Design a protein around this nucleic acid. Structure first.
Ligand SMILES: [Mg+2]
Ligand SMILES: [Zn+2]
Ligand SMILES: [Zn+2]
Ligand SMILES: [Zn+2]
Ligand SMILES: [Zn+2]
Ligand SMILES: [Zn+2]
Lengths: 49, 85, 46, 45, 299, 110, 180, 112, 49
RNA sequence: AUAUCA
């Protein structure tokens, strides 16, 4: 029972990276209904913005 | 193949414009080719509706080590007619 | 003479070519800049 | 603390500015203690 | 295309994309009027639309190099769906389905690269090396978990991702002599500098030490001081020389442990290099603490 | 431009909607369509005598459009057929079919 | 030049023509080994010429260890006589040399990586796996193991001239890639 | 109507295959190529067809055939309309549902 | 730009029959096919040359 | 797909 073969790191790593990036808060590249726009690019027009 | 009508002269042999050169519409900021066979043109031209002077140009590799380059272009926008306030 | 690329932090000039290694000499940091054209730019003072 | 795994194996700290420029992710490592026990009985204990 | 009026051998023609025309640059004759945006047209195949609202999104991109041309959708749950018909139409796809299932050996390569911390360009070379050699009569009956373990070092040896064969022996599995013969029958169809970053990191040495070890090891080879010792040993030895020269030292036991070499062997290379320690170091190396060239162990 | 055809230019006066008789679908068709393969004559750069242009329409800035020639900016593109193993319902009628069965005898057709 | 390769080992096959009882053979021979569980042959040896024979129940025999073709045939006839003396209706037939190994020293170090790059289609060099370069010659079809030290191993020959031919052919190449 | 629309013509026996103009392809860079959702959906119809043809030809196991028929039924049906009430949608790898023909004509932003 | 549905309406209101035809044809889409006189289909193999 | 514009 080789440990490195057992636990797939990419599962949680890219699983969070997907949500945060795209914004479809759910698993994963097969998302719907998933809630899009949960994560979005921070407005940097003005400081108040 | 399929070159941009814009000019490529402002490119140094590394395929980038050196920072400081003034650019203009349709001009080629970044020269790129996608060899397939001799090779098609995959270059980046400045937006045709804009112009200015190149501010800074940086060369890097990413998480897996793909060479990629970022080019900053600076203009000064002086209040004109249809300008909102 | 000639400084192909500059360093982001330590600001030490680099002058490297294609497949030389995208890194700085002393500090690690793979950032690196480009250094202004020697083809002097002129602006209208308006 | 946040780190980065470069192409040439080496792992090192990663500051927010380097993340934004090299388009990386400002993430840190998650580590968990794992234990693997084994038990046996014959044909309850 | 070539202008019908002029005809000069290098046919100088421009693509005035903005006016949607293809012109002859010499006479000015328009050679074509229908002209399409390839960027936006490609946006219809590879988009950001995963929800399904985009009317522009109407196709999907495929990879003819890796999976040939296998167009195939998947029966899945939609908005108004009974969980019954999904099962039946999926249980009906089971009777229509061997080699169209050996593509799950790509899932073996993908799960091995991600367990070996390997880039996206390496997987796609390991998957192309495996697709073009898994049905070969030249490989015949080699250990099927050692021919995909050999096609990962084939994909790494082109993508410039330093991975020793003993690094892939740790992943799976590998039988050494078995995946060493298989790494040659496919090939018909590292260096000192490679390890230095990782070993040094585990060692916890500074950039200064790494650079010098890296310089020494290269010089050692250039000098040909170590006739045929394995590069891993050379590197571990060089790391020993440089580190001992600097303040933060590392012992043979500790270097060997990281390099996965034995102290005796590191000793072997080290003593061979030591005689030319002076030539080996970087010129602006600063020996510190109390370790100058004269003082280095010499062991 | 788009080249001259001796055909008389006329305007559309009536549009006669209907369903396709399988006899007609077969009759129009310029290709059989036998294989789920796009192009790639096994790792190649030409269309397969099977799906898109088995004898069919033309694309990729190349004339070859079965004698018709012309190419892209003239060719309307002509249809192929696919011979189905067993009859299937056209999803849109499924209900008109149902209603017709509901009206007629499921043995004598009266 | 001036160097001529030295023969180091000759492997040959001989058909005795009759079935053998291996326990009997092993029991009666003066210098025999036989453990059915490890290998299916009697491992017999003679002192002159110093060789080793692998004797099978089918009556086929492999003779190895000789340094000359003469010694190979000589030792083979001797093994056959032993089988006869033990009592079987053996015959010395089909003597054939299957492999000849040779070696020499060019007296200068070689740049294996340069050679491997230059003669890439015939070469195989993985110093971490095995320190020598494996060179697969087309004509004659001989395999050479080339080492940094300048020591050379030639094998796969059916005739002595092939060993000599290959070295003559490789020498200019080894010279081109010398270190001093 | 005896000329233009006999009821026998509602059940599909032969399938008109639309030409590339209706389902364009794009050849990017030799390892990237884009096919239209219809070309995908067609290939499934074909594959499902080729399968059921082999089943009838061979020893017809009755219930393994009608099982393969109602698969064909689905692919053909889902190709003209993917938004069917009660039925599962045909999906395209990325999780997005296949753009059926109906759906190209339908909405504002439709062909009409 | 889009000469959309609501714009079609204004043109229809104005009685600008030819201005509309132009917007929809000459100024955009316009194409030429060969049709059959028997079955009013785009079947015709026009080898116009 | 989010944000936004009258
Ligand atoms: Mg207003
Ligand atoms: Zn620096
Ligand atoms: Zn011209
Ligand atoms: Zn045509
Ligand atoms: Zn009746
Ligand atoms: Zn007609």
């Amino acid at each position: 029972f080789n440990m490195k073969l057992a636990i797939n790191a990419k599962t949680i790593t890219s699983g969070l990276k997907y949500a945060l990036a795209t914004g479809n808060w759910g698993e994963q590249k097969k998302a719907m209904s998933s809630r899009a726009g949960v994560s979005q690019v921070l407005n940097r027009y003005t400081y108040s913005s | 193949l399929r070159m941009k009508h814009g000019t490529y002269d402002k490119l140094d042999d590394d395929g980038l414009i050196a920072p400081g050169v003034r650019v203009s519409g349709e001009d080629v900021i970044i020269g790129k080719t996608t060899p397939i066979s001799s090779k098609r043109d995959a270059s980046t031209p400045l937006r045709s509706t804009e112009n200015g002077i190149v501010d800074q140009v940086l060369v890097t590799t990413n998480q897996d080590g793909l060479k990629f380059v970022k080019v900053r272009v600076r203009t000064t926008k002086i209040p004109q007619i249809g300008d909102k306030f | 003479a000639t400084l192909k690329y500059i360093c982001a932090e330590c600001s030490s000039k680099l002058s490297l070519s294609r497949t030389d290694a995208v890194r700085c000499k002393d500090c690690g940091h793979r950032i690196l800049l480009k250094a202004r054209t020697k083809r002097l730019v002129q602006f209208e003072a308006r | 603390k946040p780190m980065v795994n470069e192409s040439d194996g080496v792992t090192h700290a990663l500051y927010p500015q380097e993340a934004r420029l090299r388009n990386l992710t400002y993430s840190s490592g998650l580590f968990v203690d794992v234990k693997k026990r084994t038990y046996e009985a014959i044909d309850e204990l | 295309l070539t202008c019908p009026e002029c005809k000069v051998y290098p046919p100088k023609i421009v693509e005035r994309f903005s006016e949607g025309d293809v012109v002859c640059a010499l006479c000015g004759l328009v050679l074509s009027d229908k002209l399409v945006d390839t960027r936006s047209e490609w946006r219809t195949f590879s988009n950001d639309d995963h929800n399904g609202d985009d009317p522009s999104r109407v196709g999907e991109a495929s990879n003819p190099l890796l999976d040939g041309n296998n167009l195939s959708t998947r029966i899945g749950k939609g908005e108004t769906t009974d969980m019954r018909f999904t099962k039946e139409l999926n249980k009906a796809q089971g009777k229509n389905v061997k080699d169209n299932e050996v593509q799950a050996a790509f899932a073996k390569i993908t799960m091995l690269c991600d367990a070996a911390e390997l880039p996206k360009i390496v997987k796609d070379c390991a998957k192309e090396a495996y697709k073009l050699c898994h049905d070969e009569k030249t490989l015949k009956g080699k250990s099927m978990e050692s021919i995909m373990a050999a096609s990962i070092l084939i994909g790494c040896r082109r993508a410039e991702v330093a991975r020793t064969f003993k690094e892939i022996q740790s992943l799976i599995h590998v039988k050494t002599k078995e995946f060493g013969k298989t790494l040659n029958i496919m090939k018909n169809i590292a260096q000192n500098l490679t390890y230095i970053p990782r070993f040094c990191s585990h060692l916890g040495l500074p950039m200064q030490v790494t650079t010098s070890a890296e310089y020494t090891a290269k010089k050692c080879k250039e000098i040909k001081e170590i006739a045929g010792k394995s590069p891993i040993t050379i590197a571990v030895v060089s790391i020993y020389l440089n580190i001992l020269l600097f303040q933060i030292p590392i012992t043979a036991a500790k270097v060997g442990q990281t390099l996965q070499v034995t102290e005796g062997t590191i000793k072997s290379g080290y003593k061979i290099l030591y005689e030319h320690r002076d030539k080996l170091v970087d010129p602006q190396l600063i020996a510190n603490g109390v370790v100058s060239l004269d003082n280095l162990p010499g062991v | 431009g788009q080249q001259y055809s001796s055909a008389p230019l006329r305007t559309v006066k009536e549009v006669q909607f209907g369903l396709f008789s399988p006899e007609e679908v077969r009759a129009i068709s310029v290709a059989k369509i036998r294989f789920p393969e796009t192009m790639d004559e096994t790792q190649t750069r030409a269309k397969i005598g099977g799906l898109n242009d088995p004898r069919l329409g033309s694309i990729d800035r190349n004339l070859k459009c079965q004698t018709c020639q012309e190419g892209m900016n003239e060719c309307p593109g002509h249809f192929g057929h696919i011979d189905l193993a067993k009859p299937v319902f056209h999803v849109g009628f499924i209900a008109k079919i149902k209603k017709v069965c509901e009206c007629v005898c499921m043995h004598c057709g009266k | 030049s001036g160097i001529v390769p030295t023969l180091q080992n000759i492997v040959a096959t001989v058909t005795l023509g009759c079935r053998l009882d291996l326990k009997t053979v092993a029991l009666h021979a003066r210098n025999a080994e036989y453990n059915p569980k490890r290998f299916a042959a009697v491992i017999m040896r003679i002192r002159e010429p110093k060789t080793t024979a692998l004797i099978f129940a089918s009556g086929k025999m492999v003779v190895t260890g000789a340094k000359s073709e003469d010694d190979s045939k000589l030792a083979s006839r001797k093994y056959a006589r032993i089988i006869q003396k033990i009592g079987f209706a053996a015959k010395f037939t089909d003597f054939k040399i299957q492999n000849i190994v040779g070696s020499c020293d060019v007296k200068f170090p070689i740049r294996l990586e340069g050679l491997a790059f230059s003669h890439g289609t015939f070469s195989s060099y993985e110093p971490e796996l095995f320190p020598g370069l494996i060179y697969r010659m087309v004509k004659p079809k001989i395999v050479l193991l080339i080492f940094v030290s300048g020591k050379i191993v030639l094998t796969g020959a059916k005739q002595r001239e092939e060993i000599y031919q290959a070295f003559e052919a490789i020498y200019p190449v080894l010279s081109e890639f010398r270190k001093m | 109507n005896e000329v233009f629309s006999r009821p026998e013509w509602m059940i599909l026996t032969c399938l008109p295959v639309p030409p590339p103009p209706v389902r364009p392809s794009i050849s990017f860079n030799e390892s990237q190529r884009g096919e239209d959702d219809l070309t995908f959906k067609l290939a499934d119809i074909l594959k499902a067809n080729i399968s059921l043809e082999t089943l009838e030809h061979n020893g017809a196991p009755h219930h393994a055939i009608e099982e393969a028929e109602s698969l064909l039924q689905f692919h053909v049906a889902t190709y003209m309309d993917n938004d069917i009430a009660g039925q599962p949608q045909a999906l395209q790898k990325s999780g997005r549902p296949v753009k059926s023909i109906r759906a190209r004509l339908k909405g504002k932003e439709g062909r009409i | 730009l889009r000469f959309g549905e609501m714009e079609r309406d204004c043109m229809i209101a104005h009685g600008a029959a030819s201005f509309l035809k132009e917007r929809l044809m000459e100024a955009s889409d316009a194409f030429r096919v060969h049709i059959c006189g028997i079955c009013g289909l785009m079947t015709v193999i026009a080898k116009l040359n």
